[PDB]
Amino acid sequence: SHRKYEAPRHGHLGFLPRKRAASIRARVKAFPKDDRSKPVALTSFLGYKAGMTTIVRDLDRPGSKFHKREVVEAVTVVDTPPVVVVGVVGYVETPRGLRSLTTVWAEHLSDEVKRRFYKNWYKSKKKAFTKYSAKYAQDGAGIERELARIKKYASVVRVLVHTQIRKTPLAQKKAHLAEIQLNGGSISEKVDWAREHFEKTVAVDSVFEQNEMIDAIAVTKGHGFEGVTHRWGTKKLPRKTHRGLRKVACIGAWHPAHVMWSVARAGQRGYHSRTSINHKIYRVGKGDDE
Amino acid sequence: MKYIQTEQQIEVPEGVTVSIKSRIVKVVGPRGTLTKNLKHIDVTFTKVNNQLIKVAVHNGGRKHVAALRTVKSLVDNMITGVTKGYKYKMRYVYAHFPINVNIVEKDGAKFIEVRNFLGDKKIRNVPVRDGVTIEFSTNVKDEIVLSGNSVEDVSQNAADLQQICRVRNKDIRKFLDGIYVSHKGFITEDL
Amino acid sequence: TDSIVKASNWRLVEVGRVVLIKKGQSAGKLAAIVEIIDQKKVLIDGPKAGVPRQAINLGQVVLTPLTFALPRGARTATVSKKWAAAAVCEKWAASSWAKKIAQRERRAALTDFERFQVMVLRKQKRYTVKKALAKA
Amino acid sequence: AHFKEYQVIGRRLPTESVPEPKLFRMRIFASNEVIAKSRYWYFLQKLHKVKKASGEIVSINQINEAHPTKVKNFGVWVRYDSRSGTHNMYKEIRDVSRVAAVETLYQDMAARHRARFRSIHILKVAEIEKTADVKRQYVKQFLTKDLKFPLPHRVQKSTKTFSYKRPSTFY
Amino acid sequence: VEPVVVIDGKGHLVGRLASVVAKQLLNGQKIVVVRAEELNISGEFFRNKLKYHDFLRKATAFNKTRGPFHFRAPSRIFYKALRGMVSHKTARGKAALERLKVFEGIPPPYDKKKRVVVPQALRVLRLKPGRKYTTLGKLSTSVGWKYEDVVAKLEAKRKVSSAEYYAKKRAFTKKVASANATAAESDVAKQLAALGY
RNA sequence: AGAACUGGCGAUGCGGGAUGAACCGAACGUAGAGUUAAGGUGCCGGAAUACACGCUCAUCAGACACCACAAAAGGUGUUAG
RNA sequence: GCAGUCAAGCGUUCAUAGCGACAUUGCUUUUUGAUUCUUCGAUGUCGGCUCUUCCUAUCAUACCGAAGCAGAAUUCGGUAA
RNA sequence: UUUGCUCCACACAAUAUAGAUGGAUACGAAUAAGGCGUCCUUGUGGCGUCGCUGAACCAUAGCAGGCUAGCAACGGUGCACUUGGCGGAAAGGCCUUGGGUGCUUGCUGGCGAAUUGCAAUGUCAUUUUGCGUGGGGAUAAAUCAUUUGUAUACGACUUAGA
Ligand SMILES: [Mg+2]
Ligand SMILES: [Mg+2]
Ligand SMILES: [Mg+2]
Ligand SMILES: [Mg+2]
Ligand SMILES: [Mg+2]
Ligand SMILES: [Mg+2]
Ligand SMILES: [Mg+2]
Ligand SMILES: [Mg+2]
Ligand SMILES: [Mg+2]
Ligand SMILES: [Mg+2]
Ligand SMILES: [Mg+2]
Ligand SMILES: [Mg+2]
Ligand SMILES: [Mg+2]
Ligand SMILES: [Mg+2]
């Protein structure tokens, strides 16, 4: 028989499964739409979340009753040292989706980025991109023809960049490497920009400016195995419940004779990848600035 | 009943050239040119004497021979639209709030802008199809004129303008406001 | 200039139209349409080829491009006389449709020695043709 | 099936009170002679007081079409039984023989009125010897002067599962 | 008769083509089908869209990931129609299915090969003139296939290259026809004509 | 729920009705060959994508007795009277 | 329990805006009966609490058609879970 | 870690086969319309022709295809090279220049074949792997253990350590 009183469902069925993310670096599943009239620019940046603080600002909302009045606001600070461009990759469009056609790297890779290709850096011969550096140092032969392949094909161009983890107070030493899409100019202009920016750094004020709405993509804080009461927000059972009260009382009807995928159960809470949109930049601060 | 042969006649005036390969009809006259795809209707065309064109259907049923007269009417509408043209006059009808109709340019796309319909703050914009020209007629109060070669384009633009001014949440027998097409004719009427 | 309408005319069924019988007791002979019975069947007569006067479904015949003059409902002697006067037998035999049919029959009637002979002759003609395809 | 037309002549069995009964004849469309005699007794039982046990059949002869290669127009009067009642119909059929006309009649009745052989009675079939006495349009349209029509969209039947060129429907 | 038969799926009715292809694969013929986005289904587009939404609502109630899988690409729609006609749960059916490949467009293995058609499944030979029909690429796009435009652009490029090939082939054919017409009316040609060639 | 006559199931496999005690066909030693019943012959699946005349287009078509349902009343849909 | 058909009448006037007698055709299985096929070498039996999902014969919300819709309010109906 | 790893050529083994046995032989579009040829004023053009199935076309003779002689042409084809391109949808293929070399059944000759006994698939394909030669090529990581706490029931994760 029907549910005696209606209540909305506990939790969102679109954030399933509530499993641990595959990597600690959340993926950018979509980049901004390209128009080939603006200059060549990165569509994204990498940083490290440092903490939060408060600000006071005068509100400009013509019609609010806090118009032209001070409000205090919570802000979060992302430490963003300038990122290093090492590499470009091109993507052809196929009837099975986007496919990377080739990748062209810079000649010199720093130690902090080539620590990313190792699990045991201290016992290594450090042989990584040595034959690639040998593929360099000719006139242009092995690099210019692959860049020409990217020009001839590859409707989408992405640039491989890596963080300067040594400039942060973190104890990691192993840089984070990511692909960032370029959304200006033709394909030849994009790959020319990438070639010109090999082994070179890009600062965050070249990508972002003040009063800009941006999105934050990150893996949330982990919490391990969690019960249903805090994982899903279900009602606590009454005090005189035998065999525990932090549970869901009925996990399904007799028919169908299976527990449903939509029923709330205990499991991993946190360490899920999330994309949160519409965060206004309040300050683009400079490190070389008291 | 499977009528074994039915046919209709299209008369072609002096300045008119009709070219029909497979079922793509192109008519060229003094006012311009018009084209139409009729590959959905399955008829046959035959030129008789450079002023007459027969269109026929063989072994057809009731719906098929209905479509035959429909295609004859469509083709000669194209012919009379490229000779005389088509002109639809619409009138503004209002009780209290005067309807203000002008022509604006959003990205050079030639819009018709209707303001103050029943005193509301919403601004209604209807786009103008290509080949349709709009003039606000002097010496007649509150009259807009849409002219062109394609009767389908002219009538659909006039219908779009009429449908953009529909009254909501009111008795439309009392609130008779709108822009209504009052005359359909030709640019070179009584030639 | 003048109007251009693609005519697209094809092979009417009428009295005097020559048909090639596709299947049955005749199966490959020419007959003449003597009368139309309805949309799907006609009365035909093939007296020179030995086809009897009969009502037949139009799905059993193929309409040919040949037409001669018959009055409607003409009897077999009249059909024979008009057929021989219009001389549609050799008019049929001159077409490449009839030539293709005869070629198929000849190829099927070949023997093993004859297939060897056409191999040898084809090799000789191929030598001459490929030699000629080096001057242009 | 493929119909044949038979004359069946029968009578009541002779008695001493009345020798020489009156010799009733019927024209029956039937697939064979057994069905022809069965239909004769069925209709004679509808008409006169006799049955098979009290009567006999003196003759049964197949009637051939007199001119089986002349195109005729036939009027056919039919009695038939629907799901709800009994109706009379007049139809007319352009064909070359009476048996072909009644065959396409039975086909047409089964197609258009779902009327089965057990439900149909053939009242009569007769040649309309003069045109303009033809009164149905679906046959009258074939009686115009110098009639000719094409056969658009020829569908050519292949013998192989795979063809090496796109077919043409020209004719 | 061939090792691999390549079928141009354009203008073909889905079920009739699938029945012919299923019988061929069971009998042992390798079949590849190209241009599945140009397949036809008889009936109006709205009818076929409603039929697909009816198929799309059926799923395992307690876990959707084990339910009937609704594949959106035109090649996979054809594959579904064909797997229904093969006994796919047996080893024989699995082998008959792995003798088959289905593609959107004509990919570069098969763009230089000969394409055939199946006349008993062709729309212009099977449907009555006037009957409405659906195009599988349009139906797949309406239900969620994402690659209609990229396949169309690749097909346009392929058609340009194929027209360039065909112009050269036609010119060479006219030269060959001229050569053997001039090399006709000889004694060898007359002997061949007598023998039927 | 309860009677009559017969035939069945129980006590019975086999071919067909997807499936099923009872329906249809046919009743059973172990085999070979031939022909069939009932039912079928697009593909699953052995067997004509046979032939012929019509009818039907459904934004809930229809598709085979037992049998797994549909009615009154309506429709210038179309067909024939 | 829910839905139709016919229309004598109600509705100032006016059968059908909204209703509708005398009749008559249905649907449903959220009522209660009727029955006794399944379980008596046991299928835990009222209600509430908790939680999920489904149906639509829609209370609200979206877009609409009708009125005995001037406006406001309301009533009848459609697509809609 | 006692000469290991990879590639190339053939030498011998093993291993199987969802099933070679002349050739998968490339326009696109329309079908109440097209293909091909030709001409012009280059078009939705004029004229001619074809279809009615691939029953086509190409190939195809020689010890499962031997050994030799000549004639006529300067063609056809195989092989290893070689020049220039084009192809990214899964390109891994298509086209082309030059020379070498073999064959040629286009035509005419000479020699051979038997006994597998009157048939017996009468063995001619391609897939994987191993072991040897001789000729190039290159000289790593990962895990456990320790460590971290952005992670965590355990595994797993994320860090660090010549
Ligand atoms: Mg309940
Ligand atoms: Mg509820
Ligand atoms: Mg307790
Ligand atoms: Mg017992
Ligand atoms: Mg029994
Ligand atoms: Mg079979
Ligand atoms: Mg009716
Ligand atoms: Mg009970
Ligand atoms: Mg009991
Ligand atoms: Mg019990
Ligand atoms: Mg028990
Ligand atoms: Mg239990
Ligand atoms: Mg128990
Ligand atoms: Mg509803």
CSV table of C-alpha atoms (C1' of nucleotides) in Angstrom, one decimal, chain A residues 20 94-96 99 115-116 118-120 122-125 127 149 152-153 171-174 221-225 268 271, chain H residues 86-92 138-145 149-162:
chain,number,residue,atom,x,y,z
A,20,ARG,CA,36.2,6.9,-4.4
A,94,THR,CA,36.1,10.4,-35.4
A,95,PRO,CA,32.7,8.6,-35.5
A,96,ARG,CA,33.8,7.1,-32.2
A,99,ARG,CA,41.0,10.7,-30.5
A,115,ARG,CA,59.2,12.7,-11.1
A,116,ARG,CA,55.6,12.2,-12.2
A,118,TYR,CA,58.2,7.4,-11.6
A,119,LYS,CA,57.1,5.4,-8.5
A,120,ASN,CA,60.6,5.0,-7.1
A,122,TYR,CA,65.4,7.6,-5.6
A,123,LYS,CA,66.5,4.3,-7.2
A,124,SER,CA,66.4,5.1,-10.9
A,125,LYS,CA,68.7,5.9,-13.7
A,127,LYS,CA,66.1,7.8,-18.0
A,149,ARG,CA,50.9,16.6,-38.6
A,152,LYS,CA,47.2,19.1,-41.0
A,153,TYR,CA,44.8,17.2,-38.7
A,171,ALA,CA,56.2,18.4,1.0
A,172,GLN,CA,55.4,16.6,-2.3
A,173,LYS,CA,58.2,17.4,-4.9
A,174,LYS,CA,56.2,15.6,-7.6
A,221,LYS,CA,37.5,15.6,1.3
A,222,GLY,CA,37.3,11.9,2.2
A,223,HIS,CA,35.6,10.4,5.2
A,224,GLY,CA,35.9,6.6,4.8
A,225,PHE,CA,33.1,4.1,5.4
A,268,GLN,CA,32.2,5.4,1.2
A,271,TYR,CA,36.6,11.6,-2.0
H,86,C,C1',48.6,11.4,-52.3
H,87,G,C1',45.8,9.0,-48.2
H,88,G,C1',44.3,10.0,-40.4
H,89,A,C1',37.4,7.5,-40.0
H,90,A,C1',40.1,2.1,-38.2
H,91,A,C1',45.3,6.4,-42.7
H,92,G,C1',49.1,0.8,-42.9
H,138,A,C1',69.1,-0.7,-27.0
H,139,U,C1',71.5,-1.0,-22.0
H,140,A,C1',65.2,-0.5,-17.3
H,141,A,C1',61.7,-0.5,-13.9
H,142,A,C1',57.9,-2.3,-10.6
H,143,U,C1',56.6,-4.7,-6.0
H,144,C,C1',57.6,-6.0,-0.7
H,145,A,C1',60.0,-3.8,3.4
H,149,G,C1',48.2,11.5,6.2
H,150,U,C1',45.4,15.4,1.4
H,151,A,C1',43.8,8.4,2.2
H,152,U,C1',42.1,4.4,4.9
H,153,A,C1',38.0,-1.6,8.1
H,154,C,C1',41.7,-4.7,5.3
H,155,G,C1',43.4,-4.3,0.7
H,156,A,C1',43.6,0.2,-2.0
H,157,C,C1',45.1,5.6,-2.3
H,158,U,C1',48.7,9.8,-1.8
H,159,U,C1',53.8,11.2,-0.5
H,160,A,C1',59.3,10.7,0.7
H,161,G,C1',63.9,7.9,0.7
H,162,A,C1',71.8,6.9,-3.0
